[PDB]
């Protein structure tokens, strides 16, 4: 599961 800021 990717980190919180990965899709910013």
């Amino acid at each position, epitope marked *: 599961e990717l*980190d*919180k800021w990965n899709s910013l």
Partner: antibody
Amino acid sequence: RITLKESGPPLVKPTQTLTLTCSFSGFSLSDFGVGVGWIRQPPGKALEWLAIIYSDDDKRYSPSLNTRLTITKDTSKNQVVLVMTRVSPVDTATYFCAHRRGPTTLFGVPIARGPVNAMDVWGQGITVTISS
Amino acid sequence: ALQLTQSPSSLSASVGDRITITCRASQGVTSALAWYRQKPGSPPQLLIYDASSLESGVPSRFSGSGSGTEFTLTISTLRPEDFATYYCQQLHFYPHTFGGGTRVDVRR
């Protein structure tokens, strides 16, 4: 200056519940993108990531400790609490709380996400032993 | 989970030396990697964030490079405060993995 400090009991017995508190200053958990995480360190061992909580109340836990951990924050009292149920002697370690920067903003706009790639300020750590 | 291997595990050195520690990941973590220095009895101190960015207040002798699965920390001129243990951390995947550490002791 940002500062964090861990508090709780130095000693806990097996099967018992451990509650740790992280008190901070210099930042708010209402501030955009900010997180507070917990990392522990058994004597003589490496760092182990436990959990993180963000200003938007988003939460993440260690998949291997997930059924025993609860992380929560009190924005008004600048505190983050970690509760660990049913401990054993292997839970014996130094427990740290740390700050995670949120993204850089320019006129409220997110321009850089590079600073969230680290835990920049750490507390001194609290030592907890688990013996019956 | 994500495997973060540090090399070497232990490193022998003297004051003035240039050293390099590497951190290898089982999958790409992009540039989301941090380096810390931990002296005994103290908490980890951030040196490099986002694989190469120097953190405010950290000496210029610390340097980080690499992206993807290979990362390196370079201390150009070893100072005595540097005899310690170093750690890498990954923050691209949950959970935020830590390396095993690299101990840097005084050579003899």
